[PDB]
Tab-separated table of C-alpha atoms and ligand atoms in Angstrom:
chain	number	residue	atom	x	y	z
M	1	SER	CA	-4.656	-11.753	-11.515
M	2	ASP	CA	-2.404	-10.152	-8.886
M	3	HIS	CA	-4.860	-8.037	-6.907
M	4	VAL	CA	-8.478	-7.496	-6.019
M	5	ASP	CA	-10.005	-4.047	-5.572
M	6	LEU	CA	-11.955	-3.593	-2.341
M	7	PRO	CA	-14.289	-0.877	-0.991
M	8	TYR	CA	-12.789	2.405	0.266
M	9	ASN	CA	-9.908	2.068	-2.209
M	10	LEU	CA	-8.248	-0.871	-0.488
M	11	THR	CA	-6.171	-3.134	-2.651
M	12	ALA	CA	-5.447	-6.726	-1.748
M	13	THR	CA	-2.353	-8.047	-3.487
M	14	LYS	CA	-1.294	-11.672	-3.504
M	15	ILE	CA	2.307	-12.595	-2.764
M	16	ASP	CA	1.358	-16.250	-2.574
M	17	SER	CA	-1.654	-18.367	-1.581
M	18	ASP	CA	-1.008	-17.707	2.088
M	19	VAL	CA	0.511	-14.198	2.005
M	20	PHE	CA	-1.245	-10.992	0.967
M	21	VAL	CA	-0.551	-7.283	1.271
M	22	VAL	CA	-3.592	-5.077	1.711
M	23	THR	CA	-2.960	-1.428	0.913
M	24	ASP	CA	-5.040	1.477	2.206
M	25	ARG	CA	-4.609	3.814	-0.761
M	26	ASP	CA	-6.906	6.514	0.694
M	27	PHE	CA	-4.640	6.889	3.720
M	28	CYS	CA	-1.067	7.282	2.487
M	29	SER	CA	-0.869	3.894	0.730
M	30	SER	CA	-0.402	2.094	4.047
M	31	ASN	CA	0.513	-1.593	3.795
M	32	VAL	CA	-1.027	-4.304	5.941
M	33	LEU	CA	0.325	-7.870	5.869
M	34	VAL	CA	-2.152	-10.730	6.006
M	35	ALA	CA	-0.511	-14.135	6.409
M	36	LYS	CA	-2.384	-17.362	6.926
M	37	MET	CA	-0.569	-19.864	9.085
M	38	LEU	CA	-0.902	-23.532	8.216
M	39	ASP	CA	-2.939	-24.252	11.346
M	40	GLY	CA	-5.563	-21.742	10.206
M	41	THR	CA	-4.490	-18.783	12.297
M	42	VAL	CA	-4.415	-15.546	10.330
M	43	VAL	CA	-1.755	-13.045	11.318
M	44	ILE	CA	-2.347	-9.398	10.420
M	45	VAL	CA	0.564	-6.973	10.694
M	46	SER	CA	-0.238	-3.237	11.026
M	47	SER	CA	-3.597	-1.704	10.035
M	48	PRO	CA	-5.607	0.664	7.903
M	49	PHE	CA	-5.941	4.133	9.447
M	50	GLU	CA	-9.504	3.835	10.656
M	51	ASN	CA	-12.712	1.852	11.095
M	52	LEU	CA	-14.166	1.756	7.591
M	53	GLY	CA	-10.900	0.556	6.084
M	54	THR	CA	-10.371	-1.947	8.836
M	55	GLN	CA	-13.914	-3.321	8.577
M	56	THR	CA	-13.373	-3.695	4.835
M	57	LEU	CA	-10.113	-5.587	5.465
M	58	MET	CA	-11.679	-7.899	8.040
M	59	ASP	CA	-14.682	-8.621	5.776
M	60	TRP	CA	-12.269	-9.701	3.040
M	61	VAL	CA	-10.231	-11.827	5.461
M	62	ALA	CA	-13.391	-13.488	6.747
M	63	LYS	CA	-14.673	-14.245	3.251
M	64	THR	CA	-11.435	-15.412	1.667
M	65	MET	CA	-9.536	-17.084	4.514
M	66	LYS	CA	-12.269	-18.118	6.996
M	67	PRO	CA	-9.721	-18.118	9.848
M	68	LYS	CA	-10.080	-20.103	13.059
M	69	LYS	CA	-8.351	-17.247	14.852
M	70	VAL	CA	-6.982	-13.811	13.966
M	71	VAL	CA	-3.865	-12.322	15.576
M	72	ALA	CA	-3.181	-8.645	14.823
M	73	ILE	CA	0.274	-7.210	15.516
M	74	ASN	CA	0.675	-3.424	15.818
M	75	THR	CA	4.016	-2.232	14.325
M	76	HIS	CA	4.004	1.164	16.084
M	77	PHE	CA	1.592	3.636	17.613
M	78	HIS	CA	0.641	5.599	14.492
M	79	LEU	CA	-2.784	4.998	12.933
M	80	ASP	CA	-1.144	2.647	10.423
M	81	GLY	CA	-0.408	0.418	13.363
M	82	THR	CA	-3.143	1.029	15.919
M	83	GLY	CA	-5.988	2.379	13.766
M	84	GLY	CA	-7.338	-1.110	13.230
M	85	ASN	CA	-7.544	-2.116	16.880
M	86	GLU	CA	-11.137	-1.035	17.490
M	87	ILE	CA	-12.552	-3.071	14.608
M	88	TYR	CA	-10.035	-5.957	15.041
M	89	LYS	CA	-11.319	-6.347	18.607
M	90	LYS	CA	-14.942	-6.035	17.584
M	91	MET	CA	-14.378	-8.800	15.034
M	92	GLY	CA	-12.842	-11.140	17.615
M	93	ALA	CA	-9.168	-10.691	16.759
M	94	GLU	CA	-6.431	-10.901	19.363
M	95	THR	CA	-4.547	-7.572	19.182
M	96	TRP	CA	-0.901	-7.192	20.187
M	97	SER	CA	1.683	-4.489	20.674
M	98	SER	CA	4.745	-3.643	22.702
M	99	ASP	CA	4.144	-1.907	26.009
M	100	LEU	CA	5.700	1.304	24.640
M	101	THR	CA	3.333	1.323	21.660
M	102	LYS	CA	0.347	1.060	23.989
M	103	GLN	CA	1.711	3.883	26.152
M	104	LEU	CA	2.334	6.170	23.164
M	105	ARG	CA	-1.120	5.475	21.729
M	106	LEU	CA	-2.756	6.277	25.068
M	107	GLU	CA	-0.808	9.522	25.253
M	108	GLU	CA	-1.654	10.406	21.665
M	109	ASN	CA	-5.340	9.878	22.499
M	110	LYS	CA	-5.216	12.686	25.078
M	111	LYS	CA	-4.472	15.261	22.386
M	112	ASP	CA	-6.990	17.496	20.619
M	113	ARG	CA	-8.867	15.512	17.978
M	114	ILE	CA	-10.332	18.263	15.804
M	115	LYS	CA	-7.009	20.118	15.544
M	116	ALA	CA	-5.132	16.963	14.555
M	117	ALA	CA	-7.964	16.268	12.098
M	118	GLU	CA	-7.071	19.144	9.769
M	119	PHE	CA	-3.952	17.164	8.874
M	120	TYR	CA	-5.954	15.615	6.047
M	121	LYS	CA	-7.438	17.859	3.363
M	122	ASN	CA	-10.391	15.831	2.127
M	123	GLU	CA	-13.546	16.287	4.226
M	124	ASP	CA	-14.714	12.678	3.847
M	125	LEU	CA	-11.344	11.466	5.120
M	126	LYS	CA	-11.492	13.956	7.989
M	127	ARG	CA	-14.934	12.714	8.929
M	128	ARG	CA	-13.740	9.115	8.764
M	129	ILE	CA	-10.784	9.898	11.030
M	130	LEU	CA	-12.989	11.747	13.513
M	131	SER	CA	-15.596	8.986	13.453
M	132	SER	CA	-13.027	6.484	14.682
M	133	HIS	CA	-11.573	6.344	18.178
M	134	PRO	CA	-8.218	4.511	18.131
M	135	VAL	CA	-7.351	2.240	21.034
M	136	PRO	CA	-4.222	0.357	22.044
M	137	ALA	CA	-3.822	-3.396	21.677
M	138	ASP	CA	-5.350	-5.713	24.285
M	139	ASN	CA	-2.229	-7.846	24.734
M	140	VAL	CA	1.209	-6.444	25.431
M	141	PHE	CA	4.856	-7.659	25.428
M	142	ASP	CA	8.075	-5.953	26.581
M	143	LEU	CA	9.492	-3.885	23.687
M	144	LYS	CA	13.127	-4.783	24.163
M	145	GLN	CA	12.630	-8.527	24.620
M	146	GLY	CA	10.208	-8.767	21.691
M	147	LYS	CA	7.908	-11.747	21.231
M	148	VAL	CA	7.947	-14.992	19.313
M	149	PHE	CA	4.550	-16.436	18.427
M	150	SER	CA	4.341	-20.135	17.755
M	151	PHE	CA	1.333	-21.330	15.822
M	152	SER	CA	1.638	-25.120	15.816
M	153	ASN	CA	5.407	-24.621	15.431
M	154	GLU	CA	5.081	-21.965	12.729
M	155	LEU	CA	7.054	-19.040	14.154
M	156	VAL	CA	6.313	-15.341	13.906
M	157	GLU	CA	9.063	-13.194	15.420
M	158	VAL	CA	8.478	-9.625	16.606
M	159	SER	CA	11.590	-7.618	17.504
M	160	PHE	CA	12.736	-4.077	18.211
M	161	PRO	CA	15.809	-3.052	16.163
M	162	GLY	CA	16.059	0.383	17.747
M	163	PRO	CA	14.358	3.739	17.188
M	164	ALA	CA	13.989	4.902	13.613
M	165	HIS	CA	10.692	5.992	12.102
M	166	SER	CA	9.305	6.034	15.654
M	167	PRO	CA	10.642	5.213	19.142
M	168	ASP	CA	8.634	2.022	19.239
M	169	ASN	CA	8.845	0.617	15.741
M	170	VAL	CA	9.069	-3.193	15.590
M	171	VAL	CA	9.504	-5.574	12.686
M	172	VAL	CA	7.849	-8.932	12.146
M	173	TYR	CA	9.745	-11.853	10.645
M	174	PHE	CA	8.266	-15.039	9.193
M	175	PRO	CA	11.166	-17.490	8.905
M	176	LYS	CA	9.122	-20.086	6.951
M	177	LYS	CA	8.589	-17.569	4.124
M	178	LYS	CA	11.812	-15.599	4.685
M	179	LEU	CA	9.500	-12.607	4.890
M	180	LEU	CA	10.214	-9.448	6.849
M	181	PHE	CA	7.550	-6.872	7.482
M	182	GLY	CA	9.783	-3.892	8.159
M	183	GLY	CA	6.985	-1.371	8.447
M	184	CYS	CA	7.568	2.350	8.328
M	185	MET	CA	11.268	2.150	9.201
M	186	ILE	CA	11.783	0.731	5.707
M	187	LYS	CA	12.101	3.815	3.500
M	188	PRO	CA	13.998	3.001	0.316
M	189	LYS	CA	13.459	6.364	-1.430
M	190	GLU	CA	12.752	9.060	1.180
M	191	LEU	CA	12.183	9.001	4.952
M	192	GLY	CA	8.723	10.562	4.910
M	193	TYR	CA	6.970	11.819	8.047
M	194	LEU	CA	9.614	12.667	10.682
M	195	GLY	CA	7.358	13.819	13.541
M	196	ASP	CA	8.406	10.892	15.744
M	197	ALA	CA	11.591	9.861	13.965
M	198	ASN	CA	15.076	9.448	15.398
M	199	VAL	CA	17.106	10.237	12.327
M	200	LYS	CA	20.490	9.830	14.033
M	201	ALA	CA	19.584	6.321	15.251
M	202	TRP	CA	17.844	5.217	12.056
M	203	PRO	CA	20.868	4.061	10.049
M	204	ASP	CA	22.092	1.670	12.745
M	205	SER	CA	18.565	0.419	13.575
M	206	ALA	CA	18.158	-0.419	9.899
M	207	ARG	CA	21.604	-2.052	9.824
M	208	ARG	CA	20.336	-4.410	12.556
M	209	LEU	CA	17.712	-5.682	10.091
M	210	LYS	CA	20.450	-7.209	7.951
M	211	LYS	CA	20.556	-10.154	10.361
M	212	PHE	CA	17.278	-11.401	8.880
M	213	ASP	CA	17.495	-13.763	5.961
M	214	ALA	CA	14.736	-11.954	4.091
M	215	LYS	CA	13.862	-12.702	0.467
M	216	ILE	CA	10.937	-10.310	0.720
M	217	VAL	CA	10.846	-7.081	2.670
M	218	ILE	CA	7.514	-5.300	3.064
M	219	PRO	CA	7.634	-1.595	3.885
M	220	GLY	CA	4.913	0.342	5.647
M	221	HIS	CA	4.219	2.336	2.471
M	222	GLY	CA	4.786	1.701	-1.209
M	223	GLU	CA	6.065	-1.216	-3.237
M	224	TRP	CA	7.837	-4.077	-1.540
M	225	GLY	CA	11.077	-5.614	-2.685
M	226	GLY	CA	13.961	-7.835	-1.668
M	227	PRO	CA	16.786	-7.512	0.867
M	228	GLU	CA	18.037	-4.427	-1.022
M	229	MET	CA	15.149	-2.528	0.609
M	230	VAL	CA	17.241	-2.516	3.781
M	231	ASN	CA	20.369	-1.243	2.014
M	232	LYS	CA	18.421	1.504	0.262
M	233	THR	CA	16.895	2.602	3.581
M	234	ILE	CA	20.299	2.856	5.245
M	235	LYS	CA	21.594	5.182	2.527
M	236	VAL	CA	18.443	7.328	2.585
M	237	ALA	CA	18.726	7.671	6.369
M	238	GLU	CA	22.431	8.504	6.023
M	239	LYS	CA	21.738	11.348	3.609
M	240	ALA	CA	19.294	12.670	6.178
M	241	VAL	CA	22.013	12.406	8.831
M	242	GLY	CA	24.453	14.056	6.436
M	243	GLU	CA	22.264	17.120	5.889
M	244	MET	CA	21.178	17.210	9.538
M	245	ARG	CA	24.806	17.015	10.773
P	1	ZN	ZN1	-7.565	-3.056	-9.821
P	2	ZN	ZN1	4.272	5.768	11.309
P	3	ZN	ZN1	3.664	4.680	8.204
């Protein structure tokens, strides 16, 4: 079948033999891409919110893919992005983000934990959030220049299309699979949490994603789709600009 149910309400859904989406349903249905490169390297894009979810994800990756190496790419500084870094590191993964994402995560870490913890209503989820201590990635590239990974000539392209959902949001493109992980700047129905959003910039940042020849676009939350995901996002952001003036 199309998915496997994992502990802590994680879902792992197959897109093909070498591409999976793992969804943290407990924490806002956050999507994590897991792509196995031909040379055995596993690339993970984004993260579950915290340690229990991330440990569950890594246990499943270990069991099912037995990777030679794991490379984890943070999409932005939010917990669906950096929440996995502690456990990724502990498990021997190489964690990556832009320099801005690291900076924003470090700044976010200075803020009051217990006050920001009442943002969730369930007490078990609160205790899971408070039990984790998010850290930035170990390896950093310059936001504006992006980064292209080459795993035995299999390319993974990380680029900054401009501020949208957050000032630092990047997308990850896999040209071999024509797959774009757009992350939380892909919002085909409604923009969602705007705490760090640049609504005025969002339509043009999303327009810049049209350059990718994507057959599959994976959003940070919710069902994935095709290139129309980008078009839907642009209109949703425009309506927000329209009301906002
Ligand atoms: Zn199921
Ligand atoms: Zn976010
Ligand atoms: Zn998100």
